[PDB]
Design a protein around this ligand. Structure first.
Ligand code: SF4
Ligand SMILES: [Zn+2]
Ligand SMILES: [Zn+2]
Lengths: 760, 155, 140
């Protein structure tokens, strides 16, 4: 289907266009013509990807001069799969329309977990195992050894890729992980290493945010490619949370106890290994004294160690002070460790600034910032130099060195917090430290600097006005798009009023208030009989969820709920999560019905999409406020008051609202999809909170459905279900909300879609 | 909390966490109860190591590792006379060489014969007395004050 | 029948306080042939939120601090965990009695979520057109 957008012909691969796409593709084209970053809050229920991918290919096709490569990224691998398969349909039409007359290379990327073929590493269950063992099978020393004695342990797939994969550009085509795996199986090459090398040649690539947000995790695109490359992000509100998460570090006394044993093992190993070899030890000092020591970097580009989380500017090419000598370096690490253990001995929660902590170090252990900045550099060099195999076991020592490097490098804007116990152990001493970085923008700063245009595309974030402040960012466009439908798919409502007139809420600082729990149980019980297939319940906190369920079970409410639908309760165990979701998804499809309950913050709201019959109703119990860990939150809130002048109450509202919008945002992914959504908290009735929800969702959140009684919601639900359970087929969708090629050739499509876009 | 106990008397660790370890040149852990015992008799030597000590020769140092305890005191003592900055060197490389030499001095002072160390101490001390010993101490002290001033201002 | 209200079957406690044996008492060993030594049947296509994040490669690599510590364990939580474990194990095990599991589960969940019935994939009938021959026969 030839779609022309403001003079740009787009080869759409399907029979119809969702009218929202053209306003979004216009704004996307406009931001690309302006060659700048932009915010586009496009509802998750639309095929925003297909249109986005199509316009990118059209823009790349039409302007290879302006755009060199597209680097898409989505938080989860299943989204990468759907994107790759949705791109396949796009390329299929482009290839059919062109007869494969133009080259195109689409490439999936992920960790070795999903890109290892070697039978000794592929079955390993965790990244430590995979990376440790793979490095043990391919590393500068492993390779050098194997290259002079092929009997030594090695990963054959690397050697094959090294021998044959190198300098062999892949033929144009979309290569999914399964495709690259098969090609790796076929050619016997590491698909992980094959991908990395081939990214230079690829036209489109999809990454996990970490490859771009995390500085220690792989960074494979230089400024040269970024300068003319387009960056596209799912509008995962977590993006700011991940920036700090990719840059923050927590040190616990348990970790130090592991680090101590690890350091002892290494130091004793240094003895016997020094008797094993010493010339290489001296050679390190030589290359270190001679400067960058940087002549092994290409084979250290073939190294399973994370980078230094010191970003570009943070990194330095100076000599690592007087920590060159491993024996003295071991002492330096020991001095920091003991100082930390002593610094962690503090009986109570204390917060420090990076310069204050550095001042304490200089005050007692006299450790200096500059040598401490090269700590990780010294360690990564040492790690290879000592030829140590047990990288997984060496991880706690790596963390400490990186943390020290980070603390010594990001001396401004960040802060440290010391706590003698964890939030999980307020009663018992669990001394911990959190390197709480606060300016998430500093992670995206290099991206905005390296890349030509970073565009965020899903409809989950709101208000858009707060993200340029929070991310200290300035987009070219700040737009939103209205869900355009002939038959609405969504009925957001605030059932904040109990039948007993109790104000259903969690306003009481999450205090034990049975009356709201009781009302929550009544609502859920009756709603379980009203909603078909599956239900998805999100609690504000895991504690409150557990406290609530215990009450409903004690009050017997939970048994009446079981009679209605099979309950599946989430827990931190991946076994529980996987089994619950396994049984829930199929229970929603077998004769019975299931009801998933989880927490609005947990990964369950992140990794699982409630498409169609799965989670036909999403219920948000209470406003999702995290009043636990208030100290760290206060610090970040305070810093936002300082450099950004953002009110804590304003931010708190936003932060909870975006989580509610996540659960709701994942409740629908298509037009033949719909979701009931109850916001069981009076709070949501405030014009401010309602006003900060996504504008395309607010459209359906009509005042008449605010602070509804439980009975009203049940009746409205029965009505809403009755009104949409009715047959409405593909042919009925051509009236409105779906435009065929005939409608695209009709200029009406150009004028009608203009009003679908929104701005903030 | 983390220390299992002193070889001389460990009851203090189980009794209360407020007490602090006493460091000695002996590089041997001792505690407050031992302090009283040495004051009444045998103040001149370590209770088991037998190494001579000037009366108590006890100082408060809360590190668990006596080697870090000794090295930190060695650090200050060594640094106090090896205040040379990169300014005194043509490059960071030569500076780091000197700094590594100081690490050798530290290790030698920690585990080797002090003859060369003592001679090297005295020679640099006497030669650089004005600039490295005194002038650098002043500049360094000024920076400590200036840092404290920045911290005070932020507070 | 009076003793039946004891523990697991009526109050859902943790350890084998059941009035009629309990192999689900070791609920971690009862779950070993479901999500430990064995696994679910969709564990790649879905239910894989245990290994999606940057926490999968390394634990302390995250800012993780919420999970159950080795410090400060509680029996109040054990009662909550028992209710959860009992209800989850009951639901999962009971469901398995009616649900053996299938090799198509993963591919089904992939196609069900990748294909869109709006943009494509129609649904059409396949009856047969009834063209009568010598309709005069019915007329007469
Ligand atoms: S070299 Fe390639 S195939 Fe071998 S373990 Fe590493 S990623 Fe897997
Ligand atoms: Zn003692
Ligand atoms: Zn002694």
């Amino acid at each position: 289907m030839k779609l022309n957008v403001d003079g740009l012909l787009v080869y759409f691969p399907y029979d119809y266009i969702y009218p929202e796409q053209f306003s979004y593709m216009r704004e996307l084209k406009r931001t690309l013509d302006a060659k700048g970053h932009g915010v586009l809050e496009m509802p998750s229920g639309t095929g925003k990807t297909v249109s986005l991918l199509a316009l990118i290919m059209a823009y790349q096709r039409a302007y290879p001069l302006e755009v060199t490569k597209l680097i898409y990224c989505s938080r989860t691998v299943p989204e990468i799969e759907k994107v790759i398969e949705e791109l396949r349909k796009l390329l299929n039409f482009y290839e059919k329309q062109e007869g494969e007359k133009l080259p195109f290379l689409g490439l999936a990327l992920s960790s070795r977990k999903n890109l290892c073929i070697h039978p000794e590493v592929t079955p390993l269950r965790f990244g430590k195992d995979v990376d440790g063992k793979c490095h043990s099978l391919t590393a500068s020393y492993v390779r050098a050894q194997y290259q002079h004695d092929t009997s030594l342990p090695h990963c054959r797939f690397y050697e094959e890729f090294d021998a044959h994969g190198r300098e062999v550009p892949l033929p144009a085509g979309i290569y999914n992980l399964d495709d690259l795996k098969a090609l790796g199986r076929r050619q016997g090459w590491c698909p992980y290493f094959l991908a990395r090398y081939s990214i230079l040649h690829a036209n489109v690539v999809v990454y996990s945010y970490h490859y771009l947000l995390d500085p220690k995790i792989a960074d494979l695109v230089s400024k040269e490619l970024a300068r003319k490359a387009v960056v596209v992000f799912d509008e995962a509100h977590n993006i700011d949370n991940v920036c700090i998460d990719s840059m923050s570090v927590n040190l616990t006394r348990r970790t130090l106890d592991r680090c101590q044993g690890n350091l002892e093992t290494l130091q004793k190993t240094v003895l016997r290994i020094k008797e094993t070899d010493e010339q290489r030890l001296r050679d390190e000092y030589r290359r270190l004294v001679e400067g960058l020591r940087e002549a092994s970097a290409a084979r250290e580009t073939d190294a399973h160690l994370a980078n230094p989380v010191l970003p570009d500017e943070v990194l330095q090419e100076a000599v690592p002070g007087s920590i060159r000598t491993a024996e003295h370096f071991l002492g330096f690490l020991r001095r920091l460790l003991e100082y930390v253990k002593w610094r962690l001995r503090v009986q109570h929660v204390v917060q420090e600034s990076p310069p204050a902590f550095l001042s304490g170090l200089a005050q007692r252990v006299c450790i200096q910032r500059k040598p401490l900045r090269f700590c990780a550099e010294r360690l990564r060099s040492l790690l290879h130099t000592l030829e140590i195999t047990d990288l997984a076991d060496f991880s706690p020592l790596t963390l400490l060195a990186n943390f020290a490097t980070l603390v010594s490098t990001y001396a401004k804007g960040f802060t440290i917090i010391i706590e003698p116990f964890d939030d999980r152990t307020p009663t018992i001493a669990n001394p911990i430290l959190h390197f709480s970085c606060m300016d998430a923008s500093l992670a995206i700063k290099p991206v905005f600097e390296r890349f030509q245009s970073v565009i965020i595309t899903s409809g989950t974030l709101s208000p858009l006005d707060i993200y340029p402040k929070i991310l200290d960012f300035h987009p070219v466009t700040m737009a939103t798009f209205t869900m355009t439908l002939a038959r609405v798919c969504l009925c957001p409502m605030i059932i904040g009023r109990g039948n007993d007139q109790v104000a259903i809420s969690s306003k009481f600082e999450t205090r034990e208030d049975i009356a709201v729990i009781r009302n929550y149980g009544n609502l859920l019980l009756e709603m379980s009989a009203v909603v078909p297939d599956g239900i998805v319940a999100f609690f504000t906190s895991y504690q409150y969820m557990e406290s609530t369920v215990a009450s409903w079970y004690e009050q017997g409410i939970l048994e009446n709920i079981q009679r209605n639908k099979l309950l599946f309760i989430e827990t931190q165990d991946g076994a529980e999560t996987s089994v619950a979701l396994e049984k829930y998804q199929e229970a929603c499809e077998n004769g019975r019905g299931a009801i998933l309950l989880s927490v609005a913050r947990g990964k369950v709201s992140e990794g699982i999409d409630f498409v169609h019959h799965y989670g036909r109703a999403v219920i948000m119990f209470g406003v999702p406020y995290v009043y636990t860990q208030s100290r760290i939150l206060k610090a970040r809130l305070e810093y936002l008051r300082d450099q950004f002048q953002i009110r804590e109450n304003d931010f708190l509202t936003f932060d909870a609202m975006r989580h509610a919008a996540q659960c709701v945002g994942r409740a629908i992914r298509g037009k033949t999809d719909y979701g009931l959504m109850v916001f069981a908290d009076k709070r949501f009735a405030r014009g401010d909170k309602r006003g900060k929800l996504p504008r395309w969702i607010q459209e359906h959140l009509t005042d008449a459905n605010l602070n509804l009684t439980v009975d009203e919601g049940v009746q409205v639900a029965k009505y809403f279900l009755r009104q949409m359970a009715q047959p409405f087929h593909r042919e009925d969708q051509l009236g409105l909300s779906l435009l065929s090629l005939e409608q695209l050739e009709s200029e009406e499509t150009l004028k009608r879609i203009e009003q679908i876009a929104q701005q903030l | 909390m983390d220390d299992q106990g002193c070889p001389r008397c460990k009851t203090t660790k189980y009794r209360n966490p407020s007490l602090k370890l006493m460091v000695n040149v002996c590089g041997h852990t001792l505690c407050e109860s031992c302090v009283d015992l040495l004051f009444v008799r045998g103040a001149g030597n370590c209770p088991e190591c037998g190494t001579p000590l000037r009366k108590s020769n006890f100082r408060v140092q809360l590190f668990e590792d006596p080697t870090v305890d000794k090295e930190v005191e060695i650090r200050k003592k060594v640094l106090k006379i090896y205040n040379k900055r990169e300014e005194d060197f043509p490059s960071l490389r030569e500076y780091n060489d000197f700094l590594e030499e100081v690490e050798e001095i530290v290790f030698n002072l920690t585990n080797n014969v002090d003859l060369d160390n003592t001679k090297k101490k005295m020679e640099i001390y006497q030669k650089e007395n004005k600039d490295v010993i005194q002038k650098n101490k002043l500049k360094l002290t000024r920076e400590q004050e200036e840092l404290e001033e920045a911290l005070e201002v932020e507070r | 029948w009076t003793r039946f209200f004891q523990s697991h079957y009526f109050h859902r406690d943790r350890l084998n306080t059941g009035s009629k044996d309990l192999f689900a008492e070791c609920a971690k060993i009862d779950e070993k042939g479901l999500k430990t030594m064995v696994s679910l049947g969709v564990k790649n296509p879905l239910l894989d939120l245990t290994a999606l994040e940057d926490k999968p490669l390394d634990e302390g690599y995250g800012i993780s601090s919420v999970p159950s510590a080795s410090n400060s364990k509680s029996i109040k939580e054990n009662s909550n965990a028992a209710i959860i474990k009992r209800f989850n194990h009951h639901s999962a095990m009971v469901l398995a009695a009616g649900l053996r599991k299938q090799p198509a589960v993963k591919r089904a969940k992939l196609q069900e979520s990748i294909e869109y019935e709006d943009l494509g994939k129609n649904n059409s009938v396949k009856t047969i057109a009834l063209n009568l021959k010598k309709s005069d026969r019915y007329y007469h």
